[PDB]
Amino acid sequence: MFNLNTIYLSRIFIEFNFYFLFFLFLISSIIFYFSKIISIQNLNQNSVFNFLKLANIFGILISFFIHIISFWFYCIYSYNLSLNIFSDINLYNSNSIELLNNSLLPNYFKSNITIDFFGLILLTLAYIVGFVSILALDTRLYWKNIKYIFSFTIFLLIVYVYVTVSNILLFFMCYELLLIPSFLIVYFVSPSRRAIQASLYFVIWTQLGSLLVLIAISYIISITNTYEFNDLKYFNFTNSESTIIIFLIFLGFGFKAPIWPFHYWLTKTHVEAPSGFSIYLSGFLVKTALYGFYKFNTSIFIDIDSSIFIAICIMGVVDSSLKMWGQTDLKKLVAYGTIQEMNIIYLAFCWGDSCAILGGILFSATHAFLSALMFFLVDCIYRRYHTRSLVEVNGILHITPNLGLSILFMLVFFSGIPGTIKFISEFYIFSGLLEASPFICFILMLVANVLGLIGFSKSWFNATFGMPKKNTKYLPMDLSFKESYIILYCFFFLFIFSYFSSIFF
Template identity: 35%
Template sequence: MNSTPLFYYQDILFYTSLIPLIGILLLVFISSEQQKLLKVVALNFSSLPFLIFLCIWGAFKKSVGTFQFVTTLLWIPVINLNINLGIDGISLFFLLLTTLLIPLCILISWNSINSNLKGYLISFLIIEFFLIGVFCVLDLLMFYIFFESILIPMFLVVGIWGSRERKMLASYYFFLYTLLGSVVMLLSILYIYNQVGTTDYEILLTFVFSDFEQKILWFTFFLAFAAKVPMMPVHLWLPEAHVEAPTAGSVILAGVLLKLGTYGFIRFSLPLFPQASFYFTPFVYTISLLGIVYASLTAIRQTDFKRIIAYTSVAHMNVVMLGIFSFNNVGIEGAILQSLSHGFVASALFVIIGVVYERYRTRLVKYYGGLVHTMPLYISVFLFFTMANIGFPGTSGFIGEFLIFAGSFKVNSSITFFGATGMILGGCYALWLFNRIAYGNLKSQYIKQTLDLNKREVFIFVPLICYTLILGLTPDICLNSIHMSVNNLVENMYF
């Protein structure tokens, strides 16, 4: 293990993870009537981890493929259970994505959430704490605890602050679909602990399970991670949750929570059960291709703005699965890059929906049209992220998709062909949606306001635009840090 002190604190990851909890403690003692102070405190304490992880990125050793900034905290020493924290090139950028989007979620809700504001802000700080834990923890049992704990605050965000009458049903959909698969994974973790005597991730990497054990364990982990991606047929919760969730809830769902599934496959399924991963590859390819085509065709016939983007998320995350199961550096690095790109682009698209929903209180596409005449800045941002969503060269979406298909082509050219065909459908529905919203006659009987983007909304979009362009124009800024970790992962799978 390689430990790199930062600011003379070896336990920097542990202290950083506590920052959202300190923010929660302060919010508890602030009066609910002081809404501006509540927002400022929550925004500052959610932003501070992002700044720290930027510094960690600067101190990160790109030439090292093992975990860095490693910390071990005693938990239950009697039964050999400890809390191990550490990051590598794979988890670093998911942490940066998470800690960027959480403060943006608070900014998104600055004016739209007034009822029980304190509980709302606390929920997002709890989500940030659990997400930091998911991407930092190097213990299988602790990963499961953080992985499942996120369900509780997200259930509350959708169920309490959702925008429509079906919000409770949507929150139960989300909770049950993602919980049921994970319960089976818990049983597998108990079996692993019984066999190995520990759930320490780095020790598990050195343990070799039999082929039969690998197949059973892989499939139980698959049930948990597939629901988060989501893959067919356990994707039904996602459109419902997106449609009913507040804008910030949709942003964190699409931006980070969908990445828990792909991260789980990369971090646990591939290195711990390599033979089973090879064995089930045709199964994964089949479901992924069905998901790409089905979600793309379904998106075309939707009438709700949010539901369209929700189905595009299903299609894009299934493309990521093709890259993960290419089992080579190019495909896996492309999958990581595409996951990050989707985090920025899908989040921005949901913010774009939230902007017009705050003004006109509807998400039905038929009520919009001709917004280019009244909201030119808004339409310019919408066009940029539409191009990024369909993988236009120069944006992060293009680099991620190109690397995924380049990696999968080495394994199976037919799969690459059908996967790329599905993405062509994505271009159809994305451009058609933009055309219906931006052009045509202005429907003045519905659209009576002409307010374009305000300063707060511009401030939200600027970092998302910058990171989309940076990843698209200079992907090496991320790939250089990711490469050694992915190379180490691939080598462990084959040898």
């Protein structure tokens, strides 16, 4: 009983959600600019900043809500579309349906909107992680730097255009557009003094990766004078060009999604960056490298052996997981966990368009929520005890017990109890790897799920237990409602997304 109404519902919702967000951003920006002369906080009760804050929060939430309904529409649409071509067995008829255009708004950037499952998963992750991160940045924004309240709406708009285009050039441009806001946030909002050099490291590594990706994109564009993913079906690349392109895109996207030899920038940036932006960087930003690579991996025929890339990813996993024991800073430990699971996800895209991509797609969201939760816990500890080092804080239980309980439950979920999506993603990827490489699968499993887990658990257990004897005059209070609800929502999302529709994945 699928008809045209659902098709047009899905398309209209996809386009109109973007225009909703854009009009919110434009109105709030106009109000901010034209209300005062200098555009800085007035430090009184009637500051425009207040309104702006609410506006931004409002919009994201509302857009997310619309997105959810929008997302559901797509699912049904996609499902039935497949059916409409699976059951067309008569040789005389063919599915020839041509749609119209909405008469209210123009197509942004003169392009036709096309969407896929992994793009909408990325958009949902952007929505949720941006909401959490902007909630975790209230205290950092103050006199003379309130403008960066607008950063996450800009991120949402850019990622929307990124995921809703079949233009490979606009794809690359939207991928490139994400650097300036990130650098500005690290430069102007971070409180630590060491963050000035960390931003430079972030910029230089990420831009080297972007330069490699740019070389590959220029290669593809010049050889095939086209900007559509479809036209690549009618042009063949020789062995040399295919090898050059695959190496360039792998290295360039592995600079951002940190492969083994390039994670120094990520470690420094997480150690020095503000907590909210750290949540955004681990939860969502690195995933932008997985998406683009996937697209460029799937549109080209490559006739090379993926053993070198698989070995690089596995070396990343082993190197990151072996370094967890000797970490006393909790934020660095969370960064290393992020590195190991990012490399695990990046491994799943080393077999092309095979069924290995489903585990990677699910584990991207799994890591997004796990990293958001871990960095939020680190932020709570840092704001409570004014430190994030095991040698300075322990016995988080017995004083503010809710934080300790959250730490222990986070450890359980990271260990991967069979009731959540971490176990599902591990099962997918490890089944495929065991069939593809048994000894490699065993080695990777032992290194990741035992040694790294033991180091992680030692560093986190020692902080939770003990006696907080040092400074009783300055000991803090327990969690607030905001932090409790954020942690509970992360747990709930993991457990309940273990129940998503099986048509996908």
